[PDB]
Write an enzyme that holds these catalytic residues in place. Structure first.
Site, mmCIF file in Angstrom:
data_model
loop_
_atom_site.group_PDB
_atom_site.id
_atom_site.type_symbol
_atom_site.label_atom_id
_atom_site.label_comp_id
_atom_site.label_asym_id
_atom_site.label_seq_id
_atom_site.Cartn_x
_atom_site.Cartn_y
_atom_site.Cartn_z
ATOM 1 N N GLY A 17 -15.641 10.317 -21.452
ATOM 2 C CA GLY A 17 -14.275 10.771 -21.324
ATOM 3 C C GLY A 17 -14.244 12.173 -20.769
ATOM 4 O O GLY A 17 -15.270 12.726 -20.367
ATOM 5 N N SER A 18 -13.055 12.757 -20.754
ATOM 6 C CA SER A 18 -12.925 14.087 -20.183
ATOM 7 C C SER A 18 -11.699 14.766 -20.771
ATOM 8 O O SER A 18 -11.041 14.241 -21.674
ATOM 9 C CB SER A 18 -12.843 14.025 -18.657
ATOM 10 O OG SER A 18 -11.683 13.322 -18.256
ATOM 11 N N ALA A 20 -9.258 18.851 -20.302
ATOM 12 C CA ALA A 20 -9.200 20.157 -19.664
ATOM 13 C C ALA A 20 -10.479 20.950 -19.890
ATOM 14 O O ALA A 20 -10.810 21.815 -19.073
ATOM 15 C CB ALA A 20 -7.989 20.935 -20.179
ATOM 16 N N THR A 23 -16.120 17.378 -19.067
ATOM 17 C CA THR A 23 -16.449 15.962 -19.085
ATOM 18 C C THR A 23 -17.528 15.701 -20.125
ATOM 19 O O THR A 23 -18.450 16.505 -20.289
ATOM 20 C CB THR A 23 -16.915 15.497 -17.702
ATOM 21 O OG1 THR A 23 -15.908 15.823 -16.734
ATOM 22 C CG2 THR A 23 -17.150 14.001 -17.689
ATOM 23 N N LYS A 43 -21.500 17.227 -23.367
ATOM 24 C CA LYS A 43 -20.191 17.802 -23.071
ATOM 25 C C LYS A 43 -20.410 18.921 -22.058
ATOM 26 O O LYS A 43 -20.841 20.019 -22.418
ATOM 27 C CB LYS A 43 -19.548 18.308 -24.359
ATOM 28 C CG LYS A 43 -18.108 18.785 -24.259
ATOM 29 C CD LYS A 43 -17.681 19.419 -25.586
ATOM 30 C CE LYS A 43 -16.236 19.110 -25.942
ATOM 31 N NZ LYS A 43 -15.844 19.696 -27.263
ATOM 32 N N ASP A 135 -7.523 22.930 -36.623
ATOM 33 C CA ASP A 135 -7.238 21.953 -35.576
ATOM 34 C C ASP A 135 -7.589 20.542 -36.040
ATOM 35 O O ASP A 135 -7.971 19.683 -35.237
ATOM 36 C CB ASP A 135 -7.979 22.295 -34.280
ATOM 37 C CG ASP A 135 -7.350 21.648 -33.059
ATOM 38 O OD1 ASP A 135 -6.272 21.023 -33.197
ATOM 39 O OD2 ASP A 135 -7.928 21.760 -31.958
ATOM 40 N N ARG A 139 -7.379 12.890 -33.416
ATOM 41 C CA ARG A 139 -8.066 13.000 -32.134
ATOM 42 C C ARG A 139 -9.353 13.806 -32.230
ATOM 43 O O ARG A 139 -10.144 13.801 -31.282
ATOM 44 C CB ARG A 139 -7.147 13.652 -31.100
ATOM 45 C CG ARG A 139 -6.795 15.089 -31.468
ATOM 46 C CD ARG A 139 -5.897 15.777 -30.453
ATOM 47 N NE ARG A 139 -5.770 17.195 -30.781
ATOM 48 C CZ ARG A 139 -4.833 17.709 -31.575
ATOM 49 N NH1 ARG A 139 -3.909 16.928 -32.127
ATOM 50 N NH2 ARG A 139 -4.818 19.012 -31.815
ATOM 51 N N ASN A 140 -9.570 14.519 -33.337
ATOM 52 C CA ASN A 140 -10.771 15.322 -33.525
ATOM 53 C C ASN A 140 -11.654 14.777 -34.639
ATOM 54 O O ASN A 140 -12.470 15.510 -35.205
ATOM 55 C CB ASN A 140 -10.399 16.779 -33.788
ATOM 56 C CG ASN A 140 -9.897 17.474 -32.540
ATOM 57 O OD1 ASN A 140 -10.210 17.058 -31.419
ATOM 58 N ND2 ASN A 140 -9.112 18.536 -32.721
ATOM 59 N N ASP A 153 -14.939 19.332 -33.074
ATOM 60 C CA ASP A 153 -14.100 20.277 -32.335
ATOM 61 C C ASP A 153 -13.761 21.525 -33.146
ATOM 62 O O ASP A 153 -12.696 21.614 -33.768
ATOM 63 C CB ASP A 153 -12.822 19.596 -31.836
ATOM 64 C CG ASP A 153 -12.037 20.464 -30.843
ATOM 65 O OD1 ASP A 153 -12.579 21.480 -30.354
ATOM 66 O OD2 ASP A 153 -10.863 20.131 -30.553
HETATM 67 C C1 LIG Z 1 -9.437 10.671 -28.961
HETATM 68 C C2 LIG Z 1 -10.024 11.914 -28.302
HETATM 69 C C3 LIG Z 1 -11.231 11.527 -27.443
HETATM 70 O O1 LIG Z 1 -11.146 10.623 -26.616
HETATM 71 N N1 LIG Z 1 -12.331 12.285 -27.638
HETATM 72 C C4 LIG Z 1 -13.474 12.082 -26.940
HETATM 73 C C5 LIG Z 1 -14.617 11.546 -27.544
HETATM 74 C C6 LIG Z 1 -15.801 11.351 -26.821
HETATM 75 C C7 LIG Z 1 -16.895 10.844 -27.417
HETATM 76 C C8 LIG Z 1 -17.298 9.565 -27.487
HETATM 77 C C9 LIG Z 1 -16.765 8.429 -27.011
HETATM 78 C C10 LIG Z 1 -17.308 7.240 -27.488
HETATM 79 C C11 LIG Z 1 -16.827 6.014 -27.054
HETATM 80 C C12 LIG Z 1 -15.804 5.968 -26.117
HETATM 81 N N2 LIG Z 1 -15.346 4.777 -25.707
HETATM 82 C C13 LIG Z 1 -15.531 3.598 -26.585
HETATM 83 C C14 LIG Z 1 -14.329 2.680 -26.556
HETATM 84 N N3 LIG Z 1 -13.902 2.401 -25.173
HETATM 85 C C15 LIG Z 1 -12.783 1.441 -25.189
HETATM 86 C C16 LIG Z 1 -13.457 3.653 -24.530
HETATM 87 C C17 LIG Z 1 -14.586 4.666 -24.439
HETATM 88 C C18 LIG Z 1 -15.259 7.146 -25.623
HETATM 89 C C19 LIG Z 1 -15.746 8.369 -26.067
HETATM 90 N N4 LIG Z 1 -18.428 9.525 -28.178
HETATM 91 C C20 LIG Z 1 -18.744 10.764 -28.536
HETATM 92 N N5 LIG Z 1 -19.796 11.204 -29.241
HETATM 93 C C21 LIG Z 1 -19.953 12.558 -29.521
HETATM 94 C C22 LIG Z 1 -18.989 13.425 -29.041
HETATM 95 C C23 LIG Z 1 -17.916 12.922 -28.318
HETATM 96 CL CL1 LIG Z 1 -16.767 14.092 -27.770
HETATM 97 C C24 LIG Z 1 -17.803 11.601 -28.069
HETATM 98 C C25 LIG Z 1 -15.839 11.728 -25.483
HETATM 99 C C26 LIG Z 1 -14.709 12.274 -24.883
HETATM 100 C C27 LIG Z 1 -13.527 12.465 -25.592
HETATM 101 C C28 LIG Z 1 -12.453 13.021 -24.904
#
Ligand SMILES: *CCC(=O)Nc1cc(-c2c(-c3ccc(N4CCN(C)CC4)cc3)[nH]c3nccc(Cl)c23)ccc1C
Length: 282
Positions: A17-18, A20, A23, A43, A135, A139-140, A153
């Protein structure tokens, strides 16, 4: 205790995901001198414009690398190239917000109450480390497995000194729809202001990802809270659960329950999930 990683130690597989901030890639980390392959999230942040911005990135990394709790997401390392890459343990299911939105039909009452326990345990751990998250929101919270979630976060987190119980912000960076009233009016952030945000986070879970104060502009949230109006009772919550959320939103911050109390209250309800949450096909 910040561990520095070199580019050769990890590899990017695909985008997760990504935002602001930058990525996040699904990656694989092979520690230097080893052969074990560790699945990681990478990240990659945008280039920082000011030295102040660069310090804020490093300060967030020091905090995230120092927390050690099963319900808090830790930083594994950092890579410094043309940009800053933060490496954390991979949470394969993502953020709890999108999880409850995309699995609304398959989530039972036991899962929702267990998440409330785990989030309250992680916050209680942060409170013992004298940290104010500032925060907390669905979403976090990241989903390692559907039975195990973690808080992440720390970009707005603050460490409380020896004898100070409050943090006085110099501006507005927190979404107002998660802010405690004293934070809206006096920029005061405490552990009890994190309890306000916790009650909003629970409301997000009980509504399966609804927006708090939906359709209401941010400039009119303070007016709503001053009249005594709060978030409505989600259709799945009994009176017991909803009144716990209402105590998290009391004007007197010391009238709100503390995280260590929320652990016992939600652990009790997790023992009989269908008594406190009525789901259609639970
Ligand atoms: C809701 C806010 C958000 O999207 N945060 C976020 C989290 C990560 C992230 C992920 C991660 C895992 C799995 C997915 N998907 C699985 C389900 N499909 C349908 C969509 C994609 C997406 C993101 N795993 C992580 N592990 C450690 C840290 C993080 Cl941040 C994540 C990535 C990006 C975002 C924005």
């Amino acid at each position: 205790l910040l561990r520095i990683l070199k580019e050769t130690e990890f590899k990017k597989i695909k985008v997760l995901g990504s935002g602001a901030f930058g990525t996040v890639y699904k990656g694989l980390w092979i520690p230097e001198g080893e052969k074990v392959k560790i699945p990681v999230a990478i990240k990659e942040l945008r280039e920082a414009t000011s030295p102040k911005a660069n310090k804020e990135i490093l300060d967030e990394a020091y905090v995230m690398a120092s927390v050690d709790n099963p319900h808090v997401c830790r930083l594994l390392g950092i890579c410094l190239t043309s940009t800053v890459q933060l490496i954390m343990q991979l949470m394969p299911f993502g953020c709890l917000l999108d999880y409850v939105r995309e699995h609304k039909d398959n989530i039972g009452s036991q899962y929702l109450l267990n998440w409330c326990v785990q989030i309250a345990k992680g916050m209680n751990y942060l409170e013992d480390r004298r940290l104010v998250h500032r925060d907390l929101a669905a979403r976090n919270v990241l989903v390692k497995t559907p039975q195990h979630v973690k808080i992440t976060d720390f970009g707005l987190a603050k460490l409380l000194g020896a004898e100070e119980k409050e943090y006085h912000a110099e501006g507005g960076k927190v979404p107002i729809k998660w802010m405690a009233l004293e934070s809206i009016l006096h920029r005061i952030y405490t552990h009890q202001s994190d309890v306000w945000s916790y009650g909003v986070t629970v409301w997000e879970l009980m509504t399966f990802g609804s927006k708090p104060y939906d359709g209401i502009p941010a400039s009119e949230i303070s007016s709503i809270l001053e009249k005594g109006e709060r978030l409505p009772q989600p259709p799945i919550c009994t009176i017991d659960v909803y009144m716990i959320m209402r105590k998290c939103w009391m004007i007197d911050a010391d009238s709100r329950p503390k995280f260590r109390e929320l652990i016992i209250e939600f652990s009790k309800m997790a023992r009989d999930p269908q008594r406190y949450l009525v789901i259609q096909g639970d």
